[PDB]
Design an enzyme around this catalytic site. Structure first.
Site, short mmCIF file in Angstrom:
data_model
loop_
_atom_site.label_atom_id
_atom_site.label_comp_id
_atom_site.label_asym_id
_atom_site.label_seq_id
_atom_site.Cartn_x
_atom_site.Cartn_y
_atom_site.Cartn_z
N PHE B 221 -1.51 -8.59 3.14
CA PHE B 221 -0.71 -7.52 2.61
C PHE B 221 -0.95 -7.42 1.13
O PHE B 221 -0.51 -8.28 0.36
CB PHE B 221 0.80 -7.71 2.81
CG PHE B 221 1.61 -6.56 2.25
CD1 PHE B 221 1.71 -6.35 0.87
CD2 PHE B 221 2.18 -5.61 3.11
CE1 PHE B 221 2.36 -5.21 0.35
CE2 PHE B 221 2.84 -4.47 2.60
CZ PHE B 221 2.92 -4.27 1.21
N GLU B 222 -1.66 -6.38 0.72
CA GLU B 222 -1.93 -6.12 -0.69
C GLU B 222 -1.89 -4.64 -0.98
O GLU B 222 -2.51 -3.86 -0.25
CB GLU B 222 -3.33 -6.61 -1.12
CG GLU B 222 -3.50 -8.10 -1.26
CD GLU B 222 -4.89 -8.47 -1.71
OE1 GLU B 222 -5.82 -7.65 -1.52
OE2 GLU B 222 -5.05 -9.58 -2.25
N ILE B 223 -1.16 -4.25 -2.02
CA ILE B 223 -1.16 -2.87 -2.49
C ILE B 223 -1.57 -3.16 -3.92
O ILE B 223 -0.79 -3.76 -4.68
CB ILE B 223 0.23 -2.19 -2.46
CG1 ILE B 223 0.67 -1.96 -1.01
CG2 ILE B 223 0.14 -0.84 -3.17
CD1 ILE B 223 2.11 -1.46 -0.86
#
Ligand SMILES: *[C@@H]1O[C@H](CO)[C@@H](O[C@@H]2O[C@H](CO)[C@@H](O[C@@H]3O[C@H](CO[C@H]4O[C@H](CO[C@H]5O[C@H](CO)[C@@H](O)[C@H](O)[C@@H]5O)[C@@H](O)[C@H](O[C@H]5O[C@H](CO)[C@@H](O)[C@H](O)[C@@H]5O)[C@@H]4O)[C@@H](O)[C@H](O[C@H]4O[C@H](CO)[C@@H](O)[C@H](O)[C@@H]4O[C@H]4O[C@H](CO)[C@@H](O)[C@H](O)[C@@H]4O)[C@@H]3O)[C@H](O)[C@H]2NC(C)=O)[C@H](O)[C@H]1NC(C)=O
Ligand SMILES: *[C@@H]1O[C@H](CO)[C@@H](O[C@@H]2O[C@H](CO)[C@@H](O)[C@H](O)[C@H]2NC(C)=O)[C@H](O)[C@H]1NC(C)=O
Ligand SMILES: Nc1nc2c(ncn2[C@@H]2O[C@H](COP(=O)(O)OP(=O)(O)O)[C@@H](O)[C@H]2O)c(=O)[nH]1
Ligand SMILES: Nc1nc2c(ncn2[C@@H]2O[C@H](COP(=O)(O)OP(=O)(O)O)[C@@H](O)[C@H]2O)c(=O)[nH]1
Ligand SMILES: CO[C@H]1O[C@H](CO)[C@@H](O)[C@H](O)[C@@H]1O
Ligand SMILES: CO[C@H]1O[C@H](CO)[C@@H](O)[C@H](O)[C@@H]1O
Ligand SMILES: [Cl-]
Ligand SMILES: [Cl-]
Ligand SMILES: [Cl-]
Ligand SMILES: [Cl-]
Ligand SMILES: [Mn+2]
Ligand SMILES: [Mn+2]
EC number: 2.4.1.-
Lengths: 335, 335
Positions: B221-223
């Site tokens: 999970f990376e933004i």
């Protein structure tokens, strides 16, 4: 001399139940698990479902669960003696151990996790609500049943004279069980009669007992005969581990405890791997590899993410110890 | 001209995409993840979705994905030089390490897993399909978005000048990264200009950099802002890691790599924790603890299983390094 299997053959519709130890705060994940069990097997082959908790269940919880399960549900609270430090455990020592392992391994600093492990190891099979049954199917919240199950599993266990049924197997994090193996081997040395002559030692060890390869059956999924845990061999085994202290001085899980006992105290043909039951418990899957089983039961998992034959799983160790021919493409999972 | 200078320019709708590296055999798990992204945010704030695979996607896969996604979808194959052993890597040595570790840790014996880690570390962000973007949101199969997201996260990152956004944090298994920290510390000694004076070192170390506490952000999970990975600092850092060999002689994941770079190369206020985004990647959850956020966004997770503050998570460490006020009941998660 009455042997372990003398305590079990008598039980060979079966008296069976689903059993779930769970927290009130896990309602959404449990309801999810219930929907899977309902849809895949319980509406077709109903069996009572027992729910246990170290605390009382809330009304909101019982109301929701009762509606979601189509078969009969029973709610029970755990006796405090099955969930509290034994008199011989040094709690200060235990607290420092948890404090130190807080960030070292999963659940390292958790006090509750350890009571849970000890519970699943030596007391859930003694709960009042399970007395009347011979078989149980353990189910946890946040689980998936990927495929339909078109036969009564409990009935099958009875007819085929199986005692311990599982889906996922894996290598334990040794940092949590440094002395578990040696403690178990000393046990067998003092009680050779409990070692079945045709056991599954090869799944647990690569050097005939010298050391533990860390392999164990993932206990969040079990379909087994309660009389195994109720046998003299298992009672003495659990009591030995309980006095050694590892549930609290290390972080002994019930999976490795149940597995060593199953793999050593029983003829190996009493252990059975449900290659046909699609199942997920975060973060691993058991996805039926047989095309026909997969299609016929409308499995919803990705065969390519089946954990069974991956390196860290012990499916390979299990097939080899049982002498089962591994599916032809098993090596692809070791890529 | 420093690292931020390469990022500030990107601070109209922001240029962004979802990016997913995935296998053909994981279609069902991917379709499930897509359903979550669609219902929780993509229907409301549409952004193009990029799908990458080291092998070509099948028509079945593409037809099913195009149908599941409401916004534009783009499919791409990886250049072979972004997924193959470098010439300076000893493959016989890499092979021995794999065989020896097959049963030692997860993916220990996996060849494909290591190419994947090197890929996420130094090549996804320069795949031709991401060139035109400033931001990306990594999405993996078998994921859950538990709550509604009622605002454009990309727009939000842009307006607030944030560079790296995450949800789950955890301690890495050191056996997979024995020399990662030493390699990273020598890089900084050799390039002091890349160590931002207001970095998040305390998240990574309890002793002012002497040792790594193993904390990192979960990269599934990376933004984040692509311009960080494109900066000289990061390019040089990756190249250093690539030449050391850790992706193959050990099992360096992109998670600890991305994190060490973010926490050291940027002012710590460019990093953001999405406490409001409910998310699950097996086997851990990020579940909004703030009751109003949890209810307004109709979260479907059990707040009681939020991982953020458990001992093995690095939420405490992150909150302390950022001076963030921890939620009132945070210690309950350490019990
Ligand atoms: C690219 O990577 C490869 C792979 O690592 C590099 O090759 C390797 O290079 C090293 C160093 O040059 C060699 O080490 C030497 O190994 C021998 C023992 O060799 C046997 O055992 C090896 C290890 O076996 C275990 O581990 C492997 C891998 O995990 C497992 O597969 C096994 O199952 C075992 O668990 C084994 O790999 C070797 O296999 C090869 O050979 C056999 C036999 O013919 C074949 O069947 C195989 O297929 C395969 O080809 C082999 O079985 C040691 O004896 C050496 O130690 C001595 O020398 C040292 C010199 O510095 C010294 O420090 C030691 O103390 C010791 O010396 C002692 O004995 C001497 C004898 O005269 C005395 O003179 C001295 O005084 C002292 O008393 C050494 O450790 C690897 O063998 C080699 N591996 C392979 C596969 O080739 C390669 O170099 C890399 N390339 C580049 C460019 O760097
Ligand atoms: C119970 O455990 C505590 C905690 O480890 C033990 O107390 C420590 O004992 C060592 C041994 O001398 C001392 O050096 C420490 O200073 C003690 N620490 C504390 C917390 O007091 C205690 O000895 C144990 N008791 C038993 C039953 O052996
Ligand atoms: N009643 C109760 N159940 C618990 C407790 N801790 C864990 N459990 C249950 O024990 C089982 C295993 O716990 P879980 O947190 O899922 O452990 P994991 O599988 O190792 O992640 C699940 O059925 C849980 O709901 C506890 O403190 N009380
Ligand atoms: N194309 C491709 N994608 C891969 C490969 N291995 C992993 N992935 C993707 O990389 C991401 C991380 O892999 P995953 O198996 O989920 O790793 P885990 O989260 O550590 O269990 C997922 O989005 C996968 O679909 C591979 O060999 N090829
Ligand atoms: C993957 O993690 C789960 O399984 C392993 C192996 O049984 C346990 O040690 C651990 O605490 C969790 O229960
Ligand atoms: C719990 O396992 C997952 O997370 C850890 C820590 O990020 C990785 O090392 C591992 O390969 C899996 O991706
Ligand atoms: Cl107590
Ligand atoms: Cl933990
Ligand atoms: Cl290659
Ligand atoms: Cl593996
Ligand atoms: Mn569980
Ligand atoms: Mn994943």
């Amino acid at each position: 001399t009455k042997t372990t299997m003398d305590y079990i053959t008598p039980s060979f519709k079966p008296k069976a139940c689903y059993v779930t130890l769970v927290r009130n705060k896990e309602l959404k994940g449990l309801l999810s698990s219930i929907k899977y069990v309902e849809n895949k097997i319980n509406k077709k082959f109903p069996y009572p479902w027992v729910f246990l908790n170290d605390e009382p269940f809330t009304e909101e919880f019982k109301e929701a669960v009762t509606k979601a399960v189509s078969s009969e549900v029973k709610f029970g609270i755990l006796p405090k003696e099955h969930w509290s430090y034994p008199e011989w455990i040094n709690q200060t020592k235990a607290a420092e151990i948890r404090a130190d392992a807080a960030t070292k391994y999963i659940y390292g600093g958790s006090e509750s996790y350890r009571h849970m492990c000890r519970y699943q190891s030596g007391f859930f099979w003694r709960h009042e609500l399970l007395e009347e049954y011979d078989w149980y199917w353990r189910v946890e919240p946040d689980i998936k049943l990927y495929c339909d199950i078109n036969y009564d599993v409990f009935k099958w266990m009875q007819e085929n004279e199986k005692v311990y049924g599982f889906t996922v197997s894996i290598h334990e994090y040794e940092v949590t069980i440094p002395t578990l193996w040696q403690t178990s081997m000393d046990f067998i040395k003092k009680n050779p009669e409990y070692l079945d002559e045709n056991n599954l030692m090869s799944f647990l060890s690569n050097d005939n007992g010298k050391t533990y390869n860390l392999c164990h059956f993932w206990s969040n999924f079990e379909i087994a005969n309660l009389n195994l845990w109720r046998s003299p061999a298992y009672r003495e085994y659990f009591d030995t581990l309980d006095h050694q202290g590892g549930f609290f001085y290390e972080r002994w899980g019930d999976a490795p405890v149940h597995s060593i006992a199953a793999a050593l105290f029983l003829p190996k043909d009493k252990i059975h791997y449900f290659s046909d039951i699609g199942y997920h418990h975060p973060p691993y899957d058991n996805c039926p590899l047989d095309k026909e089983v997969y299609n016929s039961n409308n499995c919803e998992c990705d065969q390519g993410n089946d954990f069974t034959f991956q390196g860290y799983s012990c499916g390979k160790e299990y097939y080899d110890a049982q002498g089962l021919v591994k599916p032809k493409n098993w090596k692809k999972f070791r890529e």
